[PDB]
Structures are given as C-alpha cells and as structure tokens.
Amino acid sequence: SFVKDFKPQALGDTNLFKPIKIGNNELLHRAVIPPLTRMRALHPGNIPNRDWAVEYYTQRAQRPGTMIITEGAFISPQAGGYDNAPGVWSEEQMVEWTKIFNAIHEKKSFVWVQLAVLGWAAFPDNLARDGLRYDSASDNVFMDAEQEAKAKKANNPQHSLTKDEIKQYIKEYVQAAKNSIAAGADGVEIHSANGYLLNQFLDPHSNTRTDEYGGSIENRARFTLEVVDALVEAIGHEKVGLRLSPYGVFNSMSGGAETGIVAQYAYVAGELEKRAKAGKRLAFVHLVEPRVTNPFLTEGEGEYEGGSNDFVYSIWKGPVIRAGNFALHPEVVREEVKDKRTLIGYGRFFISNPDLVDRLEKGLPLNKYDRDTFYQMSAHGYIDYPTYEEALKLGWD
Ligand SMILES: Cc1cc2nc3c(=O)[nH]c(=O)nc-3n(C[C@H](O)[C@H](O)[C@H](O)COP(=O)(O)O)c2cc1C
Ligand SMILES: COC(=O)/C=C(\C#N)c1ccccc1
Numbered sequence: 001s002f003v004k005d006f007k008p009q010a011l012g013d014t015n016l017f018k019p020i021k022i023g024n025n026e027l028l029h030r031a032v033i034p035p036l037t038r039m040r041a042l043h044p045g046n047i048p049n050r051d052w053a054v055e056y057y058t059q060r061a062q063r064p065g066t067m068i069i070t071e072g073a074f075i076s077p078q079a080g081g082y083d084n085a086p087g088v089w090s091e092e093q094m095v096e097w098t099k100i101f102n103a104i105h106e107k108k109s110f111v112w113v114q115l116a117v118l119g120w121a122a123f124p125d126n127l128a129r130d131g132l133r134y135d136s137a138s139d140n141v142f143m144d145a146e147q148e149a150k151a152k153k154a155n156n157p158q159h160s161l162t163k164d165e166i167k168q169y170i171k172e173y174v175q176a177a178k179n180s181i182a183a184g185a186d187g188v189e190i191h192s193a194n195g196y197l198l199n200q201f202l203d204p205h206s207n208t209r210t211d212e213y214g215g216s217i218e219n220r221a222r223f224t225l226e227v228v229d230a231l232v233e234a235i236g237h238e239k240v241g242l243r244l245s246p247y248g249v250f251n252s253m254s255g256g257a258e259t260g261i262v263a264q265y266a267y268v269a270g271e272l273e274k275r276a277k278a279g280k281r282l283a284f285v286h287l288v289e290p291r292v293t294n295p296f297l298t299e300g301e302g303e304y305e306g307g308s309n310d311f312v313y314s315i316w317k318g319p320v321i322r323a324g325n326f327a328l329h330p331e332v333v334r335e336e337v338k339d340k341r342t343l344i345g346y347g348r349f350f351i352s353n354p355d356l357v358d359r360l361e362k363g364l365p366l367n368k369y370d371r372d373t374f375y376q377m378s379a380h381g382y383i384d385y386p387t388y389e390e391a392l393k394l395g396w397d
C-alpha cells in the first residue's frame with residue numbers, strides 16, 4: 001500500500017529536475033539511486049542474480065537520464081564475507097554485470113559500481129571456510145562482542161592489516177575498477193562510509209594503529225586517499241566518486257561523539273579539492289546525512305542533530321550527492337537543491353518505488369517499503385513493487 005499520512009509535494013519546479021553532468025554522464029534530473037545491498041547474489045562465487053537482477057535495475061532505470069549507483073560489490077574474495085552480495089573480480093560475475101549495465105543503458109540511464117570491502121563487518125566464519133583472513137585496521141578493538149566471539153570460534157581472529165596487505169587491497173581496487181569499466185559501467189564509487197574497511201581506517205575508534213596508517217588525521221585518511229589516487233590513475237578522475245558518512249554510527253563508527261570527526265572528514269574533502277585544483281577533480285562526493293546515522297533504523301530514528309554536512313561545501317567545490325530520509329521530506333529537499341551542485345540520493349524508497357522519479361516530479365503517493373525483504377533471496381520485495389499506474393490498478397488508492 002501507499003505510505004499513510006505522507007503529504008507529497010511536486011518537486012518538478014525545483015533544481016531536482018534540472019539536468020546536470022556527473023563525470024561523463026548527462027543526467028536529466030538529480031534524483032540518484034544510492035548504493036543498496038539486496039543480497040540476491042548467488043553462492044558460490046558471489047554471482048549477481050541470474051534470474052532477477054537485470055529486471056530490478058531495468059525497472060529502476062526507467063526514468064531516462066537517472067544516475068544509478070549499484071549495490072556494493074566486493075573487489076576480491078578477501079574483501080567479502082557475505083555469500084549473497086555480488087563481486088566484481090571474476091569473469092562469471094562480469095558476465096552478469098554486463099547484462100545489467102546494458103539494460104540500464106538501453107533505458108538511457110547511467111550506472112556506477114560501488115566498490116566494497118567489508119573489514120570487520122564481514123562474517124569471520126564464511127571467511128574461515130574460504131581460507132581468508134578477518135581483516136580490519138586494528139586487532140585490539142572490535143565491531144561488537146558477537147563478531148569478536150565468532151572470529152575466535154572460527155580460529156580467525158581479527159587481523160590488523162600489514163602495509164603489504166593494504167597494497168594488495170589497492171591492487172584489487174584497481175583491478176575491480178578496470179573490470180567495471182570494461183564491462184560497460186560509467187564509473188565507480190569508492191565506498192569509504194558506513195563503517196566498512198576504509199571507514200574503519202578513518203575512524204579513531206576503530207583505528208588504533210601507530211604506523212603511517214593511524215594515529216593522526218593525515219594517517220587515518222591515508223588508505224582512502226591511496227585508493228582514490230590509484231583509481232584516478234587507472235580509469236580517470238571523471239569515472240571516480242567517493243562516499244563518506246561523517247556522522248554515521250552504523251558498524252560501530254564514532255559519529256559526532258568524537259570531537260575530531262569533522263576535522264577528519266574536512267581533511268579528506270580538502271585533499272580532494274587540492275587534487276581537483278591540480279587538474280584531477282573527482283566526479284562527485286557522496287555524503288550520508290546525519291539525518292540517518294544508521295540506515296536500519298526507521299526514518300526519523302537515529303537522527304543526529306548536533307552536526308551538519310554543510311562544512312563540506314566550504315571545502316569541496318564539485319558535485320555533492322546527499323542521502324538520508326529525503327523521500328518523506330520534500331520540504332527539506334526543496335531547500336537543499338537550491339544549491340546548484342547538490343543531488344539527492346533516495347535509498348529505501350527507491351527499493352519500493354521503481355518509478356520514484358516520476359512520483360517526485362508529480363507529487364504522487366509513495367509505495368510503503370517492506371524491510372523484511374530488503375535482504376532476502378526472493379523476487380518478492382525486489383522486482384514486484386508496482387509503478388504508480390500498477391498500484392492504482394491494484395486499488396492501492
Ligand atoms: C537495505 C539497505 C542496503 C544498503 N546498502 C548500501 C550499500 O551497499 N552501500 C552503501 O554505501 N550504502 C548502503 N545503504 C545505505 C543507503 O545508501 C542510504 O545511505 C540510506 O539508506 C539512507 O538513505 P534513505 O533514507 O533514502 O534510505 C543501504 C541501505 C539499506 C536500507
Ligand atoms: C557488498 O556491499 C555490502 O554488503 C554493503 C552493505 C551490507 N551489508 C551495506 C553498506 C552500507 C550500508 C548498509 C549496508
């Protein structure tokens with residue numbers, strides 16, 4: 001059914017519906033599909049779902065000129081640990097991704113692959129089964145007691161990466177980016193948010209290292225910036241974006257409770273602008289808003305009111321995608337898009353509304369989402385949410 005009590009607003013008269021260029025892509029509107037893990041990939045081999053993934057992305061590409069960022073895709077087996085999330089390291093994976101990218105392009109939309117590395121969020125038992133390490137920045141602080149226990153039980157204790165192992169990940173990022181472009185993607189997004197491996201290096205709670213990769217703002221940012229630089233070299237700055245969540249607490253990150261958190265992220269933005277001014281500007285910076293510090297809490301919950309991402313705009317001068325509880329808040333979007341380099345990512349409601357862009361333009365009711373099927377091995381709750389037309393025919397009004 002439709003979300004009850006929601007009072008839609010037509011946003012067609014705002015900059016949300018003004019075209020903008022991101023990297024090589026001429027977007028026709030500024031409603032972006034942010035990366036959304038759905039867990040339909042099949043085991044073994046982390047293969048994008050052979051039955052439904054093309055349809056899922058085709059549905060959500062239906063509005064011409066939409067920028068789509070894929071679900072997180074593992075750069076290598078060592079980077080993974082969830083059996084049903086896809087990878088981008090193998091030929092068998094790329095066969096399916098190619099079909100997906102082709103379908104999106106047939107609909108005249110665009111696709112950016114999010115490159116994912118789990119670190120301490122991985123399942124240590126899956127990794128042990130596959131002969132792989134359980135990795136993080138440090139080895140003396142853990143995501144939670146359950147993860148620490150699972151690792152010990154699996155004889156796969158959390159391991160602090162060596163410098164050589166960091167270089168190996170960088171090699172894998174480079175190859176994953178190359179694979180993505182070769183299969184037809186428009187670009188990649190480096191995931192450095194939501195408490196996954198790169199975020200584990202950025203955050204002083206999870207990073208207690210005393211080598212060059214920890215112990216200061218510059219050191220904590222080193223790994224993320226090395227990945228940025230490696231990918232810019234490999235496939236070009238116009239095909240690379242970076243995602244950050246300064247105020248996130250998901251996966252045991254610090255958020256605003258850490259008084260140095262804004263400085264840490266301001267440093268990263270500054271280093272990106274420095275590179276931009278020296279001729280290599282990333283396609284975009286993608287920020288998760290303090291509106292959503294944990295995306296598995298219902299909209300309105302876990303909202304941090306003691307911080308703003310506005311600081312980034314004083315530093316980074318390129319496009320900024322902002323995501324977090326915007327679908328139910330057109331009044332906030334109306335104000336944010338007055339800034340002419342701001343795009344809006346809509347996550348959970350793009351899960352439930354394949355024609356979300358039409359609904360935003362025209363001020364239509366939104367399909368409620370079913371959180372139970374966010375992660376599920378099913379077409380149900382994946383490719384069977386109706387368009388507005390289909391919803392009316394089903395009597396949802
Ligand atoms: C089911 C689900 C899966 C997600 N998967 C990813 C992901 O793979 N990579 C990522 O950076 N963010 C991921 N996110 C976070 C979203 O991109 C987004 O930032 C968040 O849901 C807040 O936006 P929203 O309120 O519009 O949903 C996910 C969120 C949800 C609910
Ligand atoms: C492969 O990439 C992932 O598995 C990504 C997530 C999971 N699980 C993820 C990333 C950010 C926010 C929520 C889930």
Ligand SMILES: [Cl-]
Pocket residue numbers: 310313339
């Ligand atoms: Cl601003």
